[PDB]
Amino acid sequence: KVFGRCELAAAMKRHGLDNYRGYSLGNWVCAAKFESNFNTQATNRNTDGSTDYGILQINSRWWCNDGRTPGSRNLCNIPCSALLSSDITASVNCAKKIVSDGNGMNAWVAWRNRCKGTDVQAWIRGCRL
């Protein structure tokens, strides 16, 4: 599924991301835009052989099982295919574990390089929340 901007903001808010670990909703929308272009089916392979999955590009080295990342962990206790669903529940629940792991949203490279220190409230402007 390719979400609209305000449709995703509303889904993230219902699942408890607004101000989760102090990160306002626009941070989460900005990260999804630059990680996946709001597409739940996005995948990207990394040089180490791991793969990033779904709207928040969650990596198979630590967070999910894909059967093809040797020596990896599965800290979200999910198959990586669950992160590609039109229902963002599994992605949000796993993201809450990642952002709690000590480095905050710096775990997402596109957030650090394209969202951090910018006017992130612009990503939710005009939405009926």
Identity of residue 47: T
For the question of residue 35 being annotated catalytic, the response is yes
Nearest-approach distance from CB 114 to Cl ion, in angstroms: 6
With CB under 5 to 8 Å by kind, the binding choice for 113 among Na ion, Cl ion, none is Cl ion
Binding-site string for Cl ion from residue 76 to residue 105, where x marks contact by CB under 5 A and - marks none = -----------xx-----------------
For the question of residue 119 being annotated catalytic, the response is no
With CB under 5 to 8 Å by kind, the binding choice for 69 among Cl ion, Na ion, none is Na ion
Give the separation between CA 19 and CA 26, rounded to whole angstroms: 10
Neighbours of 86 (CB within 10 A): 9
- CA torsion, ordered 107, 85, 34, 44, to nearest 10 deg: 70
Q: Which helix (H) or strand (E) holds 89?
A: helix 89-99
CB–CB of 49/12 below 8 Å?
Answer: no
Nearest-approach distance from CB 92 to Na ion, in angstroms: 19
Q: 52, 66, 87, 119: which is the annotated catalytic residue?
A: 52
With CB under 5 to 8 Å by kind, the binding choice for 60 among Na ion, Cl ion, none is Na ion
Binding residues for substrate: 101
